[PDB]
Design a protein around this ligand. Sequence first.
Ligand code: QA1
Ligand code: QA1
Ligand code: CA
Ligand code: CA
Lengths: 171, 171
Amino acid sequence: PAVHLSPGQEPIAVMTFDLTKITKTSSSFEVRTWDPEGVIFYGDTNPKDDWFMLGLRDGRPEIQLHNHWAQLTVGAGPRLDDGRWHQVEVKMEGDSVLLEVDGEEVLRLRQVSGPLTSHPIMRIALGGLLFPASNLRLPLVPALDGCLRRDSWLDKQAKISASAPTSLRSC
Amino acid sequence: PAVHLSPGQEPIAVMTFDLTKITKTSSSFEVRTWDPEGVIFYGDTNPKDDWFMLGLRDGRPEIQLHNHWAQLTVGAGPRLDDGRWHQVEVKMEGDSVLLEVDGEEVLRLRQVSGPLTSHPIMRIALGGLLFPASNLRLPLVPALDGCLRRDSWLDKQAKISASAPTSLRSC
Ligand SMILES: C#C[C@]1(O)CC[C@H]2[C@@H]3CCC4=Cc5oncc5C[C@]4(C)[C@H]3CC[C@@]21C
Ligand SMILES: C#C[C@]1(O)CC[C@H]2[C@@H]3CCC4=Cc5oncc5C[C@]4(C)[C@H]3CC[C@@]21C
Ligand SMILES: [Ca+2]
Ligand SMILES: [Ca+2]
């Protein structure tokens, strides 16, 4: 069962987590698209100075990140806009964030985060940002005309709230 | 004709460039190694606050960079410590630094540099750093037991000096 990721650029779903209860710090999903550019997911504890975006630009994964330890805009991995399903896994390990595409590690951002446990509320938004696209380090057009399935986000034990699925649209 | 990249951790060669004469901002070489960790090349305009390192860690490319615009430690691309020759190309394009391995773009560090043209002296060191390994953002053991061939560095028109090849050791 798959869902569409995208007129407005609002995300299709938002989840909130209690950071003091996170034990699993990874997320996995599959994505399919013919679209070269857009947001796959966004997360923050504060949209002004502690946020993260995973998207596509020119078909390839791009991460933008802004927190106390790091500020970066990085592209990596193969093009994903070929209309095939691709597995993507994001993992936080130690002080690094890892990106795996189709079971291959394609990017490791080292020394970018202290302990999640140590503002204890994190938001994850699917298919859009929780601020205007002009707030990005490098703007992109957020609407990703793609589909998402088999998605699991961090720790269901730590989840406080999740948006009304009434809005989800099947692919 | 190939040369060894590595007891001391000193680089095997240093070149100096006039930054005001650089037109070609790319470098290409081939590397072969069974070694998972070490420095491939280092460059700077100032070893205290304007420097760059490309190496291997756990077999894969790693870039460490520290300048006015960016400070990062990033891993990307496939393992290269399989004893096969691999082409590596580093390109500066706009404000980004691009890494290509075997003809595939594996990493794009965006918004990390202003114009090279605009201290106008850049050093490139092969197989070692021009400061102690403890100065790195994330230390590694610099000696890379590998071989280097078909290597071209930036713009021969901009090169001011190049170290005595008397020291080079054929593979
Ligand atoms: C706290 C904090 C932060 O400094 C601010 C925003 C956080 C990301 C939000 C989204 C996210 C989702 C996610 O899914 N698997 C692992 C992760 C971890 C990441 C990449 C989080 C890593 C730590 C980040 C950068
Ligand atoms: C100036 C300046 C800097 O901010 C300080 C050190 C510079 C690198 C030195 C080594 C280098 C060699 C090289 O080989 N092809 C392209 C490049 C460009 C790079 C990656 C350079 C990019 C710009 C850098 C980060
Ligand atoms: Ca789009
Ligand atoms: Ca080594």
